Amino acid sequence: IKAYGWAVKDRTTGILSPFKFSRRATGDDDVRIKILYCGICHTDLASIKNEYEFLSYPLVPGMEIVGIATEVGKDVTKVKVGEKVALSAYCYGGLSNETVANQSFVLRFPERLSPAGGAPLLSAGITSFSAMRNSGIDKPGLHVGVVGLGGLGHLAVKFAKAFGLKVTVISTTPSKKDDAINGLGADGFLLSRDDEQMKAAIGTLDAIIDTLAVVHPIAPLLDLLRSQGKFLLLGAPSQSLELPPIPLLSGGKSIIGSAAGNVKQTQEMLDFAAEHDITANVEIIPIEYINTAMERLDKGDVRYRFVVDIENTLTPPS
Amino acid sequence: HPIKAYGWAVKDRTTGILSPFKFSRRATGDDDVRIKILYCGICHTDLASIKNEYEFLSYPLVPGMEIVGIATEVGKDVTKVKVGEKVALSAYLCYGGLSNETVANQSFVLRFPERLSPAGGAPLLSAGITSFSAMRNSGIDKPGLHVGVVGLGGLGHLAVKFAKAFGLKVTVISTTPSKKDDAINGLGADGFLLSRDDEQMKAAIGTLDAIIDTLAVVHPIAPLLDLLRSQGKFLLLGAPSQSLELPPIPLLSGGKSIIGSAAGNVKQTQEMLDFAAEHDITANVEIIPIEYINTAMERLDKGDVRYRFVVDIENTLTPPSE
């Protein structure tokens, strides 16, 4: 029933510190999950940045949880104790020694994937996978643009390439050209701040995958879309964006929200990622580094994912 | 003192059939590391030994050289490795990896990177290091160079991944048209050349800075040499059983060279492993149970795997009846 982790005790500071708490006992349909790794996504950074008003005073962040089933209720049939499992994010998150969830919320973590590199698949991976699949951008030949080479974006590139798409990375960090092209497999690299290159790419893209969490302008991006092209909104900005009616109507173009859910689809994504050997490029960090990573994350100073090592790094205060 | 062990061995070199086998290993010396084997990759050298192509091999033969495991005992003088650490074995240095455990001098034992899958990471220890070291030793690691990879198998598909992470432009030369999508979209190759397309072959003459030949069967190298620019390098990485036909004219007139692999240097192997960790490079593997090993061998002889068999020894190896 007892548990421990790292928590933000003061919403104004956002600083994480050790916290002990207690968890519900394993019910008849629940699954015991020993947490080995938890990925750090933007939602965690935002919650630490005091951007979610509905937050509870002690905040344990982390949504990309890969773990080991170590106990199951009597009615749990799919999951077995000892199995490497991961939790789709549908009270206390993943920066803890263990968690408990209804068996329906647990997915089997594929044999062939690293649990550390595979953990950001459970939020970033399914988001990219679901958006591309639901919107029918999975077809070999399509030219797609990925806006923002962050955590979500760099995974979007890998899924897009494994779908057989041509991928252009649209970013504001010129130093990332080699990572995008050689490290992630992108076919092209477009500098957002180069209107000359930008104007050359007008009407070239079948679809755009927007992973940014800042407001930014979408009108210059929409102009990169061919007629009837699709603009996939995957990032969740705190503010809202300014839809320019003129560029959208003229062009038959559409903006589609990311229904990145459907835990059954999440399992399909995991099996897809297993077949194509897709994981995130990860930086495994100790929990005592979490606050430094938070400031590195806010400044984009990471190579596309922080993953906290619950395995060897959470030490038990009590 | 000596520790009993079990695995699968070829008891009759003439048939090449593997079956359960009991044996014994030396006790842990002061510099040794006992390793519980989790995964063993299957390489071509394993297939060749099973096909009885090495006359100097002693039998019963337990094959397998791409070993990832957990250290379970260390000698008193061993400080680098600690019990419980995920480790990997150098292929350089009687009974191989298709067994429940092995023991090795600490100098041959490598730290297995946190970020790599132990199953997908196991072929790095023979196929990975071969590609990595050959590219590094011969100076084909420079962003911009155009390299061709001959043969999209276990070695070849890893060569492409390392080449792309080095920043090279990579053309895959194959005789399997169905492999075009994996090569270009799945592995990141910039082009796919059909060896048997005289139009494509003649169009690529003199375009390649280097060639990485991974094939293990006998084949002609003259048309491949012709794809090389002047002073180009032909890296021979596969080990055919028969000998190859060196055409003197294409080589001499081109100033071209054929370079052997020498994929060793455990220090280089750790460099490769850390490199593979930073760039998230693993093999595309098919995890199989040990009792499937004979069927996997015959699939392997025909190249019917995408792209590496890895035996789940941890969960699948049981002792002979006992």
Numbering used by the authors:
A (entry chain A): 12 to 101, 136 to 363
B (entry chain B): 10 to 102, 136 to 364
Question: Could you share sentences copied from the article?
Answer:
pmcAlcohol dehydrogenases (ADHs EC 1.1.1.1) are NAD(P)H‐dependent medium‐chain oxidoreductases found in all kingdoms of life. These enzymes typically catalyse the reversible reduction of aldehydes or ketones to the corresponding alcohol. The structural motifs of ADHs are highly conserved in all known eukaryotic examples; most notably, a zinc ion involved in catalysis, a second zinc ion involved in maintaining protein structure, and the Rossmann peptide‐fold involved in cofactor binding. ADHs have been shown to catalyse many complex biochemical transformations in plant natural product biosynthesis, suggesting that their catalytic repertoire has been expanded.
The recently discovered DPAS reduces the substrate precondylocarpine acetate to yield an initial, unstable product, which is hypothesised to be dihydroprecondylocarpine acetate. The site of incorporation indicates DPAS catalyses the 1,4‐reduction of the α,β‐unsaturated iminium moiety and is thereby the first reported ADH with 1,4‐reduction activity. We report four crystal structures of apo‐ and substrate‐bound DPAS from two phylogenetically related species. These structures reveal, surprisingly, the loss of the catalytic zinc ion from the DPAS active site, indicating that zinc is not strictly required for reduction by ADHs. The lack of the catalytic zinc in DPAS is substantiated by the observation that two of the conserved catalytic zinc coordinating residues are mutated (His74Met and Cys168Ser). To investigate the catalytic mechanism of CrDPAS, we performed site directed mutagenesis of key residues involved in coordination of the catalytic zinc and the proton relay. A DPAS mutant in which the zinc ion coordinating residues were restored (Met74His, Ser168Cys) still reduced precondylocarpine acetate. Collectively, these findings suggest the 1,4‐α,β‐unsaturated iminium reduction catalysed by CrDPAS does not require a catalytic zinc or a proton relay, but reintroduction of these features did not abolish activity.
